[PDB]
RNA sequence: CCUGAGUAGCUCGGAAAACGUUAUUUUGAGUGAAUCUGCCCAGACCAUUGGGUAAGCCUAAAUACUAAUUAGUGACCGAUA
RNA sequence: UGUCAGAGCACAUUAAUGUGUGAUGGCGUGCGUUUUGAAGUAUGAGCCGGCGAGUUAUGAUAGCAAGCGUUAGUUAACCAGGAGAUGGGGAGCUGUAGCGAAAGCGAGUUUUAAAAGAGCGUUUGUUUGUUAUUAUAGACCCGAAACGGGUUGAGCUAGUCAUGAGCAGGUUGAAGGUUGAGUAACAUCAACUGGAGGACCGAACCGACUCUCGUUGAAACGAUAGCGGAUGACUUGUGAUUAGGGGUGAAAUUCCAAUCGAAAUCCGUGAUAGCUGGUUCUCGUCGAAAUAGCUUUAAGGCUAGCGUGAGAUCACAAAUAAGUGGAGGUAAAGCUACUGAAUGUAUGAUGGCGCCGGCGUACUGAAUACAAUUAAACUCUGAAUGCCAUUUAUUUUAUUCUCGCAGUCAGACAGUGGGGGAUAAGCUUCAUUGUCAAGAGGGGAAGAGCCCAGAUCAUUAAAUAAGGUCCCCAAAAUAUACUAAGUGGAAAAGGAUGUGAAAGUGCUAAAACAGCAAGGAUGUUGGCUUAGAAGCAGCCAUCGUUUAAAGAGUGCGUAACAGCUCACUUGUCGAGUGUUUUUGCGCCGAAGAUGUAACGGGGCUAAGUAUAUUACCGAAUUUAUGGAUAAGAUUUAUAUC
RNA sequence: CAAGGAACUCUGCAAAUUAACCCCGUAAGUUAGCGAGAAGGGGUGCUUAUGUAAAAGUAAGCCGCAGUGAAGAACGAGGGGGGACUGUUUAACUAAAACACAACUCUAUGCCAAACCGUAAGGUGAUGUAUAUGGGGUGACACCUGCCCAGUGCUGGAAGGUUAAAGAAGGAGGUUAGCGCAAGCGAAGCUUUUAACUGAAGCCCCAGUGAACGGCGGCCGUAACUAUAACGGUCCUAAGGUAGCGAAAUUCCUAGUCGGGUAAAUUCCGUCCCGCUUGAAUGGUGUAACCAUCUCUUGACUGUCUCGGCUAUAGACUCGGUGAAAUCCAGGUACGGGUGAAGACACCCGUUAGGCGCAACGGGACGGAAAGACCCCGUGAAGCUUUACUGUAGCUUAAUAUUG
RNA sequence: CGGUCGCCUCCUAAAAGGUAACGGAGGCGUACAAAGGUACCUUCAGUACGGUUGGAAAUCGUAUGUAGAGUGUAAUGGUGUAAGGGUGCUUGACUGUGAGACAUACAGGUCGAACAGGUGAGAAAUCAGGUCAUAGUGAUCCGGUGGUCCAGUAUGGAAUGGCCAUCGCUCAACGGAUAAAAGCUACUCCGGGGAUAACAGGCUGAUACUGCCCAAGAGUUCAUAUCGACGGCAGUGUUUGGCACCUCGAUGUCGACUCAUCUCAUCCUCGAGCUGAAGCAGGUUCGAAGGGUUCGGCUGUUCGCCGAUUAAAGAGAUACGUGAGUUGGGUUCAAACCGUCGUGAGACAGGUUGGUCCCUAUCUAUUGUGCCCGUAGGAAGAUUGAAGAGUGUUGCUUCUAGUA
RNA sequence: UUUGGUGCCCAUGUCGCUGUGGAAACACCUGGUUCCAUUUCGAACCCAGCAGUUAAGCACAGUGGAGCCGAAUGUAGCUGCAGUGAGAAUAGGAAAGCACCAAGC
């Protein structure tokens, strides 16, 4: 591939990796407003694994609560209401008619510590794997351009700055996770 | 700043050959003297005009050179050898 | 009867020759004739022809040069020369 | 750092508008150097005195003169003598026939069947003297790191050998063995023998790891305060020892006489130096290039072109104007006349589809018509300018050739057309037009490339060019308007009843605008809908009624309302009332750090700007006179052009 | 020098703090030797007496503000990294994480040894004698040194192909005696030419030798997602780094995460193992002690600092004597703006300054010495390395004379 | 390092020709007894119409079509009975030449009337010395092959030499220095360059920063309370740049300490205005440069991160200011290791340890203090003020008042 | 001058549409018997003649339908702000023209 095509392939792989990383960081305990914290965790509806988007809708009326809207209030709201409680939430939920409104008081300083530690370690694993793929791409590049040094150096900083941009995006998303954690 | 160079992909040509006409109107010329250099026939041969194997147009007799227009709309050009007073 | 044998020479590397190896000459290695009927050479060589017979030596003369002496000179330098 | 002058002062000479000196006015940013170029913050030069760098030997070529001169000239060498020319001396050479590879032939040869056709031949010179150039000689002066050879250094360090010395003092107390206890015996325990230990502290000594001072030092590595070793991997003395494509090296490219990727000394060698530096009398005349090609080549070198000098050509040559003639395919313009692209619209192809070959295809859209288009590599066409040749007229011996000597390629700037870069760059690449380089001056605030312009010299003479006229600073005023920004004398898009003028545009003394007063409703809270919008949350139509007047409401204002208010119409009073457009000068937009800092300044509302007039100033320009002189001509009077 | 006390800072550089003698007490580790002056406390005086050969020590009294009263006297502890250590190192920048080093391992050498030097005798080795010498590498001690002979180098092997000089099986031609009408054939001498075949060593060839150079992977499916990789298949290689360690003198990301450290620490300590480019004698891990070794923390300690100042000198200043240097085109050598070969004491514009000094301190004169030495070029030099070329020392092979 | 070195085609190239580019577009290191020639015969592509399989596209019949077909080929073109196709015939795809032109510094390369002889095609006049054309090729030294009316070292031959023809040579750096030659040197040095470096300085302002406008929209509504795309205008010099310049016979830097200054695009203290400004705490826009705007840990790190504190811990410039004021911590001498690379000298825009900063002040400016003169008869006091300079920081608590 | 061939120019010329005409002709037309000829074949060609025609080619008239061509202004483009001079668009013509020879006339 061309060096720009090398960047494109690396960006595709990094986009998949970022989808993965967002998926894991979502489930990790926070102040818990993440719609995808609940989404990547399947629910036990009548003893069966079910999702939430394909079954219900999510909303946030106040900026400290979450609202779940199912279609059925006699057969479907219970299957999600049972699994909302006794989970990583640690809060007592209530139902207001056709919607479950769950409040999320801030976590204790200790559980928040392990949650942040594990989130940072997950981001570290993603970082190490992304750098490994970057080194693989650089190996293909040294198989590719071995002629003009000034051009090969240009390719080196091209890959480096692409990596820095993706690192910045991942760190910004981590900061978003940390702020909504508050 | 000082980056790599190479593969400009362009900037190549050949030696510009002296192509075109070889006589001026009003010049008294002789036989076997070349008048025009071209490819194909952009200038058509008139009386006493010979063709050399490199698509060259030369005179065949002694006389003066003149230009004439021919073709359906007179867009084509001929060169004729109008001989001097003889 | 004799006239200058490891001789001339042939080959392997050479060098000198204007010649960067070519007639010719010389040898570190090998090889090695004829006896003036012969040999050498006449820029490979061959025949005829020409000339001389190597394989011993010496040789004033014109030759370079002044370290100096004798007399003299300098379209030589004059104490920064 | 002085010039042009110059008050005054003191004098009086190669006696002459004299000398010295200058209160003060005008003017003025060194010399060589190399570069496109330096007052240069580019380099060298403190100054002074001498000295200090293109010669020679030979040979050739070119120029000028001479001797001889159509078989002449001339001798190399050698000899006679004054260290002399000279004479004796033709040894040979050049020119006297060339062609062909040569044989060979020859006023012809060779190619060739051919002397066809072509090449050269089809005939002048020799030798010296001067100058210049070239060639071999180190061959203008000087500067390299460098190489080899011949030698000397181990006295300094290093290495070993033999001879010796030295380690003040005080410590700690190992191994080993004896004895006694213990232990089956050991192992072990205590005393003793003992004083070993790349053992300790610590003199001297060895080395110098660190702080400070020092840095043309007291010192070419120190002073002082700390440091390690200081019984051994120990320091030293004496004599020898190993020497340089070599030795030595607890190894670092260490050391080998304060210096060493390999010491110094003498020579080859005066090595080489496309790179630096310099190169010493006068004057006259002419007087380029920084471009092209080639290059183990880009700093260099070779050839061209160019300049210059001698000759000839000397108007058929070359230019300058006038004219004719040709090409182009540039600009423009167009692109159903192409090429690629591409848009608005119509019947609508192919038709997907729907559809029982048609039926809608509301999509893709052929071609066509439509009105426009974009192109350096688009051109149905299609300019001009220019270029060439050509005719007429002027000029030249020349921009023609040969010969001798060259020089330059690292150009730059401004304008035009560009390209690249960004129609960024005082940038690069180009072509063209001019400048500097190689040539100064005035304007331009001072400025190499801008404008005017081309300088023999002296002028205390005139006309001027560009350009300028309030003052600095020579140099003008009148009239017409604008300006109130100091615009002039930084600015952008946008904005603005700034402002002047121009053009038209409605009413109107039956009274125009305005100022202000009165109403301004109505079905009607029209409905969708907001529990709460109905004249104004959001949406839909947004009309008629009475009225001069009136909008499902101009807005304001309300949860809805309401209410206020206006368009609309009338009224009080009574002379101006509007945008419609285009131009001059304006304002904002306009914030950065030595001192105003985007008129030269003081200042300027003219001393600013544009408009017509007559003026003036003002250049090394031109003219004038005077002096010299160069190239030429009547001609030698030493006169003129 | 009142107080603080490393807060200044790349870092306790430096300085201060500790000392000498006697008496208590001294740990971890430990390879028993050390650690140890460990860590830490008390006293050192005068007179009398007890005291001994001399003391030391002790009792009583005596106070000073303080009694090795002056003198010269290790500061210490902990953590981490490297190296075993004591030591050698660039004379005159760098004293070490380097080198050396005992030890370990590999290799060659049977004597007139290998080796090294010299041309050569000859000499060390060595007048040694394989437990000795020489080389290569790793460098207390303890435990290991995983795979691969692909290519290379070495050793061994001989068939096979390939192999010189040289020898001659043999071929061809010239000159011409002669034979020939020509044409031509052509004896002998010389002439000229390399080909049958022989021709070694050696190379290609085959094995072993990696504690000899050295190197020692990918693709796909599958692990409560999964990029990961426990796993299973495929391709390639000679084998695909085994162990061990693993942000290390190695880690770009990185200042990686984590806990301690720290109020607050891009440094530090241990850990996390996909480790850009770790890695096992071009060795790996623990590793006792030690370093004029490096770094961090800590008790004390101080004008390093907070925050600087004073006393004495030697200067600095003056007086008398003596007295040089670098620099140096010439100068009477201001300011701001602009200009320029783009940073103006000399230029133009405006401003101001009587002239000459002395003492500090040096903005500028793109200050001084140093024809760039940083980078580039020169058809420059020099050295160094090498499957760059050509030679060549040395070693080895064949022929020939020695040599039958 | 890239790419190129030779040659040809289009634009660039601005209408004679021609003109550079590391500018924009492509190729050649050729093909052919036909694709040369001669004589004769013949005329498009495409599109349309109608037809067995058979259509979009196989082909024919016709019309139409100006040749966009085709031309051995890269592009230029031309090429409408042609420069193209079909038939037959030969291979002039001649020998010796050649007046004369082209283009050009040389070398060379391009055409060439016409002649002598011989032919071929066609009965023929006429044509044929290669293709419709332009790339399509390497001199020379040396060497080989055949022929030669050339010479044969005294002669005779021969060998051998000479002439013509022929072949070998990516001398592809392609006008080519030998038949034959790679790297390292931070161990390096010699001569040169601001014409070729990093920095500084200077020009430009792409970019960077800042300001502004247009305002869809978000904002119950309402662009401009607070923002504001979609887009542009500009400015600054200040971040990254382009520049190859006065300067490389020398303009010494990153940082740390000291000295600070000026400016505003103001951070606080000063003042004013608007609010989606109940108060308080504010946001907002401007005038506004007088003063001030912290400490500690880490990084050599300026910077940057963290903690604490005030009203705040503003931003730039002065050679990334500041050694003729101090230090070199890093950085950029050798020295050494780790990981990697080159096999090898070595290198790392990697880390790692240390690893020498010269000065007797000439002048101006600049801070103090004197000497002579002036200030007009000499001397001594006291002044005005001409001109400026220093200085213009600011917090907390309480009362008014828990009042509005 | 009418017809046929043919000469210069090589669409202002043409292409097309509506008619007329051939006595002599030019042409169609009748055959492959003959020389010759077909990538084949009397299609073309060559031999030999006009039974039939103005059909068509052909010429003359009208037709400006398509296409071609095209009056002036100015600017565009340019050369020292005057000159130079467009293209395009437009009216519009053009239904080719100059000839020679042989006959009929």
Q: Which residues of chain A neighbour B2 with C-beta distances below 8 Å?
A: 150
For residues A42 and A50, the answer to whether their CB atoms sit within 8 Å is yes
Closest by CA to A51, choosing from A36, A41, A62, is: A41
Distance CA B40, CA B54 (A): 10
A20 CB within 8 Å of a chain B CB = no
> B26: helix, coil or strand?
coil
Closest by CA to B57, choosing from B76, B81, B25, is: B81
In this structure, is the CB of residue A137 within 7 Å of any atom belonging to strand E?
A: no
> A122: helix, coil or strand?
helix
For residues B48 and B79, the answer to whether their CB atoms sit within 8 Å is no
Tell me which method was used to determine the 3D structure: cryo-EM
- Which pair of tokens denotes residue A142? 């040294």
Q: How far is CA B61 from CA B38, B48, B53, B57, B65, in A?
A: 21, 6, 19, 13, 11
Closest by CA to A179, choosing from A3, A8, A34, is: A34
Closest by CA to A137, choosing from A169, A165, A154, A159, is: A159
Per-residue b or e along A106-120, where b marks 16 or more CB atoms closer than 10 Å to that residue's CB: ebeeeebeebbeebe
Cα first-last separation, chain B: 75
Distance CA B67, CA B36 (A): 12
Distance from CA of B4 to the nearest CA of A (A): 5
Q: ∠ CA A133-A28-A64 to the nearest 5 degrees?
A: 130
Distance CA A45, CA A134 (A): 43
> CB-based burial of residue A78 (10 Å sphere; 0-12 exposed, 13-18 middle, 19+ buried)?
middle
Distance CA A50, CA A6 (A): 39
Distance CA A67, CA A83 (A): 14
Distance from CA of B67 to the nearest CA of A (A): 58
Distance CA B63, CA A113 (A): 109
DSSP designation for A57: E
Distance CA A102, CA A83 (A): 12
């Amino acid at each position: 591939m061309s060096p720009e095509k090398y960047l494109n392939f690396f960006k595709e792989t990094a986009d998949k990796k970022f989808q993965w990383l967002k998926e894991e960081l979502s489930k990790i305990r926070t102040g818990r407003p993440n719609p995808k914290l609940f989404d990547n965790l399947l629910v036990e509806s009548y003893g069966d694994r079910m999702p939430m988007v394909a079954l219900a809708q999510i909303a946030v009326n106040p900026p400290r609560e979450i609202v779940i809207k199912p279609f059925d209030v006699k057969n479907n709201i219970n299957a999600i209401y049972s699994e909302i409680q006794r989970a990583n939430l640690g809060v007592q939920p209530v139902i207001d008619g056709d919607k479950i409104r769950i409040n999320f008081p801030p976590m204790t300083q200790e559980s928040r510590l392990e949650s942040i530690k594990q989130a940072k370690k997950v981001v570290e694993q993603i970082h190490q794997e992304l750098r490994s793929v970057r080194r693989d791409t650089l190996q293909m590049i040294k198989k590719d351009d071995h002629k003009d040094e000034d051009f090969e150096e240009f390719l080196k900083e091209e890959v480096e700055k692409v990596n820095k941009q993706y690192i910045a995006q991942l760190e910004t998303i981590q900061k978003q996770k940390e702020k909504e954690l508050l | 700043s000082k980056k790599g160079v190479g593969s400009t992909k362009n900037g190549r040509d050949s030696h510009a050959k002296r192509l075109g006409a070889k006589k001026a109107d009003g010049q008294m010329i002789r036989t076997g003297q070349i008048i025009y250099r071209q490819r194909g026939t952009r200038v058509y041969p008139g009386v006493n005009v010979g063709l050399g194997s490199d698509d060259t147009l030369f005179a065949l007799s002694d006389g003066l050179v003149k230009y004439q227009k021919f073709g359906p709309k007179q867009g084509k050009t001929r060169v004729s050898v109008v001989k001097h007073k003889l």
